[PDB]
Amino acid sequence: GNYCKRTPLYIDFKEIGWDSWIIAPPGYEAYECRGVCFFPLAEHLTPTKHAIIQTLVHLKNSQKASKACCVPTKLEPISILYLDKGVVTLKYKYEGMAVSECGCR
Amino acid sequence: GNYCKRTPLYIDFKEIGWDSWIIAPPGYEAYECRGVCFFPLAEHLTPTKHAIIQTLVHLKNSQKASKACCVPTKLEPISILYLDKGVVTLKYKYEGMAVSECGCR
Ligand code: NA
Ligand code: NA
């Protein structure tokens, strides 16, 4: 089923309104994290102790706390070519842009 | 309204069955993170670039990606007295247990 995992998400810079300064790429594979954090929390989702205990509290009481959340736990940079006061400029490592790993938190 | 923040959450170890191996304390203030991540994402929620972009894509297209999630971004230890493979063990800082900061991710 839809257990927590990384899934595809292509973002075109026109959607976010950044085509005003970004020249290239026109968009990028950003990925996203979707799905449920189900007990027992799988090791590959690197759950914290708090996420484990919150999940267990909620498992037997759905009106107390809530499920752990599927979120990015590791992000990767991309390169962007952009306009810096009208001068074409390249940043090789624009950090925090694409998901490489997901986890329950 | 219900913006992402830290909220109280007391966890009695009995209610999760961890009293089988945790001798003391009987429970602790674990806290939890609750609420929505609304654009513009407030700076105190330390949003990543991915969280900002995902939120913006979702803002004008509710059927693409999703909202960023309110999760713990800093966890604190507690002291516990417990049984480890059948011997009473003391650990002054059992890490990852109590929320001290929340953020949007
Ligand atoms: Na792909
Ligand atoms: Na697109």
Author numbering:
A (entry chain B), B (entry chain A): 320 to 424
Q: What text appears in the publication on this structure?
A:
Attempts were made to crystallize BMP-10 and obtain a high-resolution structure. While BMP-10 crystallized in many conditions, none of these crystals diffracted to high resolution. A chimeric BMP-10 with five surface residues replaced with BMP-9 crystal contacts (N357F, Y358F, A374T, Y409L, F411Y) was purified, crystallized, and solved. Unfortunately, the condition was at pH 6.2 and the crystal contacts disrupted the residues adjacent to the interchain disulfide, thus neither strain nor radiation sensitivity were observed in the chimeric BMP-10. Crystals of the BMP-10 Crystal Chimera formed at room temperature in a one-to-one mixture of 5.0 mg mL−1 protein and 25%(v/v) 1,2-propanediol, 100 mM sodium phosphate dibasic/potassium phosphate monobasic pH 6.2, 10% (v/v) glycerol (Rigaku Wizard Cryos E11). Unfortunately, an analogous analysis could not be performed on any BMP-10 structure due to both limited resolution and local disruptions (caused by pH, type-l receptors, or crystal contacts) in BMP-10 crystals. As such, the extended analyses of BMP-10 are limited to disulfide bonded cysteines in published structures, and it is not clear whether differences in these structures are due to deformations caused by local disruptions or fundamental differences in BMP-10.
